Every structure is written in C-alpha cells, then in structure tokens.
Amino acid sequence: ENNKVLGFLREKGCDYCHTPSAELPAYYYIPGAKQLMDYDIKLGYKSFNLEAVRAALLADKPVSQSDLNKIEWVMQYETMPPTRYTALHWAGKVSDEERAEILAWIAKQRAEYYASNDTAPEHRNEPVQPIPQKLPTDAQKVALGFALYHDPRLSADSTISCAHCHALNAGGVDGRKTSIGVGGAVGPINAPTVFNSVFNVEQFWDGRAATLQDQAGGPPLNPIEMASKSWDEIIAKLEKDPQLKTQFLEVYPQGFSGENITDAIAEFEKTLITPDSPFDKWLRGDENALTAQQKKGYQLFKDNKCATCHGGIILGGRSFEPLGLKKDFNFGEITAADIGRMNVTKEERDKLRQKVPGLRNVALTAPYFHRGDVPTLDGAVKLMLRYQVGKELPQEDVDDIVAFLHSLNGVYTPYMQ
Ligand code: HEC
Ligand code: HEC
Ligand code: HEM
Ligand SMILES: [Ca+2]
Ligand SMILES: [Ca+2]
Ligand SMILES: [Cl-]
C-alpha cells in the first residue's frame, strides 16, 4: 500500500518536477512555453521535495507532517500536476478515485504517527495537533535549570541571563527587533520564544543545534550574546554559591560543567510548554472555545496553504522553508542571517531557507519574521500571502486569520506556586 502510492507518483510524472532534475530532452517541452515550463520544474522542486517522501516510504518510516500536509492540499484542491502538462506523454491526470485514495493514505499516516488520543474524533485528521498537557521531566533537574536559566553569571558582565532575551512573562522573548548582548552588541536575528521549543526538529533559525541541550551551549559562549570566554569562567563564579552548588551536586555529583549546566537548563525548558490554548480546547471537543470568527479564520488558514508549512503540534518548527517561496522576497540586501540553513548545510537549495516558526503564542512574540521588522500580525499574514502562497486576500479574511492566531495563546503554569 506504500508501493501503491509510489507507483502513482512514478506514473503521473511527479518526480520530473519534484526531484533534482537534469535539463529534460526537447520533446518534453511545449513550444511557446519552454521558459514557463523550466520555471515550473524549478518551483515544483523548491516547493516540495519528493525524494524525502520516497525515502521515508521505502524505509517504511513516517512521512513528515509538512509533506503530508502539502500532498493533502494538492489532492484536495486538485492542483497537481499543473493542468497545462496533463495531455503530455510524461504527465498523468489524477482521477477522483486516485485522489480519494491518496487522501485516505494520508489520513492513516496521520492516525498511525501524529494524531493524539485526546483530541476529539472529528479533529483527529487535522494537519495540526494540540500541545501535550505534560512532558515527563526530572523535578530536581528542572529546579536547577530554573535557577540557571535566571542566573546572570553565565554572562561575562554577570548582568545577562537567558531571561534577558526570553522573559517567561513576556511570551518567552525580549520584544526587540534583535537582541542586545554584552557590551551592547546588537544581534543579527530576532530571538524566538523558548515556549514549546522542545517540539522543534532542530533549534535556531538555521537549525544548527540538534537539541535543547546543544542550543543551550550557544548563548553562554557567544560573543554577541552572553560572551563568556569559557565554561571555566562561568563555573569559577557559580562555585562561590553554596545554596546552588549544594543543590547542583545532588544531581550530577560530578560537579559543574558545560554538559551538566546545559542538561539542567534543557530539562527546565521541557516544562516551558503552553497547553490549553482556546484552540487546543476546541481540538479536544469544546465547541464554544472558539468564536465564529476564529473557526472561519482556522478554515481560511488551511485553505490558503498555511498548514502546509505551519503544521503539527506547534504549527511549524518542523521544517526549513525559503522566505520568498512563490515570489522573490524584497531583502534589499541579503545578509548572512538571511542565508539561513545554507550556513549549516552549504547546499544551494537551502539558501534563504529558515526553520518555519511555530505560531503557538505568536500573538505574544511581536515583532515578527527573522529580521524582527514586521510589527503586526496583519502585516505578517499579508506578507505571507504574497510571498509564501502567491495570493491576495480581502481585509475581512485577513482579520479572520489573525483572530484565529490569537486563539493559539496557551497557558504557561509559572514554575513557582
Ligand atoms: C540561556 C541559557 C538561553 C536559553 C536557554 C535560550 N537562549 Fe536564546 N536566542 C537568542 C536568539 C537571537 C536566538 C535565535 C538565534 C539564531 O537563530 O541564530 C535564540 C535562540 C534560542 C533558541 C532556539 C529556539 C527556536 O525556535 O529556534 C532557544 C531554545 C533559546 N534561544 C534558548 C538570543 C538570546 C540571548 C540574547 C542576548 C540570550 C542571552 C540567549 N538567547 C540565551 C538563551
Ligand atoms: C497563511 C498563508 C500563512 C500564515 C497565516 C502564516 N504563514 Fe508562515 N512562515 C513561513 C516561514 C519560513 C516563516 C519565517 C519567515 C522569516 O524568515 O521571516 C513564516 C513566518 C510566519 C509568521 C511570523 C512568525 C514569527 O515571526 O515568529 C506568521 C505569523 C506566519 N508565518 C503566518 C513559511 C510559510 C509557508 C512555507 C512555504 C507557508 C505556506 C506559510 N508560511 C503560510 C502562512
Ligand atoms: C501527481 C504528481 C505531483 C504531485 C503529487 C505534486 C505535488 C506537489 C506538492 C505537494 C506541491 C506543494 C504544494 C504547493 O506548493 O502548492 C506541489 C507544487 C508544485 N508542483 Fe507539483 N506535484 C506533482 C506534479 C507536478 C508536475 C509534473 C509539475 C511540473 C510540470 C509540478 C510542478 C509544481 C509546481 C510549479 C508547484 C508549485 C505550485 C504553485 O505555486 O502553485 N508538479 N506539487
Ligand atoms: Ca498524460
Ligand atoms: Ca518574534
Ligand atoms: Cl514532522
């Protein structure tokens, strides 16, 4: 049944536009439309990478939620292949039968791997899931991580803790365009929320850190941020604190180290989740948790492809997408921060790609985009319609999507109670 889906993808010529492609032979091309056809071949690949899906299918593994979300969408609205190629020898039209089957195969992929038991039956096939209400953690290590998160001694100055860039009462963020580090260093990119970071595939806009623990070793030693020379410098200061040291040795009787401080902080960060958004309560069957407008907004959100990228538990955070997918973005000049994932991979296709932001709590993490230059949700939604979807929408529909986004404010239970 995996093989049935693979047979279909091969049959219909999807791989011609959604894999890395040689210049095709001349008899594939429509006279008068060679350029549009080359542009379509490239945009296909930029938009959707079928080699990822083929690879997962053949190891019998889960297809990513973004890839299911994309495929569902194209099947739902009957977009693929583009209708102008379907009378060609190499590209097939897709029948109602076949569409219904793919849509069914997605639904059982989502049921096997992604849907949660506690969401209402009617909503188990959504491209999105509620935040789990609890993650298992080690309570003693959480208490350490909580103290270290808020300890300015990890910075050269002893003035900056993690909280300076990620205040837990202000959405996990500093509310600045980009963050201000030691010596007043102005940083290169907008600081994302620590809320629900645990659900990201990888951490940092470029995805250069694999886990929360690896991420936590970054800012302490980054000259642009906390700017400590070494863990030795930091520990020489933490060592003079009995209360903290005594508690620390209780866990990790090895003593202070980068490994162990980053581990403590990471464990704390697994408690920085925000379940019971009005949206999540609605996914769990409470029909009155959303307004009429927010339900419409949610429908619009799916209709305009937002859930293709912003899917899963945190409505994003799961994949790397180019800023300017469907239309070149007005960078003015492209900086190293705009280059994004390519800094990590060195791959041309990753140029300008950026971890899709989870939209959980987005109403609380202004300003927006990685540049920190988009001050409102109205703006961010419009800019995403133009550049990521290739579309305009009337005001009233934008207002509705924005209302829906306000529904994603979860509930953080403060550590101390
Ligand atoms: C202190 C120990 C912490 C912890 C636990 C975190 N931060 Fe920050 N942070 C800052 C900026 C600008 C970014 C994005 C940087 C980039 O992409 O290059 C981050 C990123 C993170 C993440 C990743 C989250 C994600 O969704 O990708 C996490 C989990 C995180 N931080 C936690 C800015 C700052 C600071 C500015 C001066 C300081 C200080 C810190 N961070 C410190 C910490
Ligand atoms: C409906 C059409 C969509 C809405 C509504 C939003 N998106 Fe996206 N999105 C994508 C990326 C790669 C980013 C980060 C961009 C950057 O580098 O500046 C975003 C960002 C947003 C944001 C801002 C969130 C924040 O700053 O933390 C919002 C509010 C947002 N998106 C809403 C990627 C994609 C994507 C990929 C192809 C699509 C189809 C969409 N986004 C669609 C929507
Ligand atoms: C059944 C075969 C195919 C499947 C399953 C498929 C799937 C997809 C998917 C998942 C997307 C991403 C969703 C999106 O960005 O809108 C997409 C977009 C795209 N595909 Fe394909 N595709 C197929 C065939 C083709 C072919 C043969 C071409 C080119 C001749 C092509 C060109 C594109 C283009 C240009 C886009 C960007 C769409 C846009 O902006 O409207 N696709 N396709
Ligand atoms: Ca055909
Ligand atoms: Ca922001
Ligand atoms: Cl995923």
UniProtKB/Swiss-Prot annotation:
Record InterPro entries: Cyt_c-like_dom, Cyt_c-like_dom_sf, Cytochrome_c_Peroxidase/MauG, Di-haem_cyt_c_peroxidsae, Haem-bd
Membrane topology per record: Single-pass membrane protein
User: Could you tell me what induces this protein?
Assistant: Expression is increased under anaerobic conditions. Strong expression requires both the presence of H(2)O(2) and the absence of oxygen. Expression is dependent on two transcription factors, OxyR and Fnr. The dual regulation by the OxyR and Fnr transcription factors ensures that ccp is expressed only if molecular oxygen is absent and H(2)O(2) is present.
Result of changing H89A: No change in activity using either ABTS2(-) or hydroquinone as electron donor
Q: Which residues form the Cytochrome c domain?
A: 1-110, 140-242, 292-409
The phenotype of cells or organisms lacking this gene is: Disruption of the gene leads to increased sensitivity to exogenous peroxides.
**Where this protein primarily resides, as one coarse class?**
membrane
Q: Name one Pfam family in it.
A: Haem_bd
* Record key words, sorted: Cell inner membrane, Cell membrane, Electron transport, Heme, Iron, Membrane, Metal-binding, Oxidoreductase, Peroxidase, Transmembrane, Transmembrane helix, Transport
Where located? Answer: Cell inner membrane
Q: Describe how its activity is regulated.
A: Does not require reductive activation for maximum activity, as peroxidatic heme is high-spin His/OH(-) 6-coordinated. Calcium ions are needed to attain maximum peroxidase activity.
Residues at which heme c 1 binds? C14, C17, H18, M80
Q: Which residues lie on this side of the membrane: Periplasmic?
A: 1-417
pH curve summary: Optimum pH is 7.0.
Residues binding heme c 2: C162, C165, H166
Its EC number(s): 1.11.1.-
What UniProt notes about the protein's domains is: Is a non-classical bacterial peroxidase that contains three c-type heme binding motifs (-CXXCH-). Contains a C-terminal domain (residues 171-465), which is homologous to the classical bacterial peroxidases and binds two hemes (P heme and E heme), and an additional N-terminal heme binding domain (residues 42-155), which binds one heme (NT heme).
Record's subunit section: The recombinant enzyme lacking its transmembrane domain is a monomer in solution.
> Which named protein is this?
Cytochrome c peroxidase Ccp
Organism for this UniProt entry: Escherichia coli (strain K12)
UniProt lists the gene as ccp
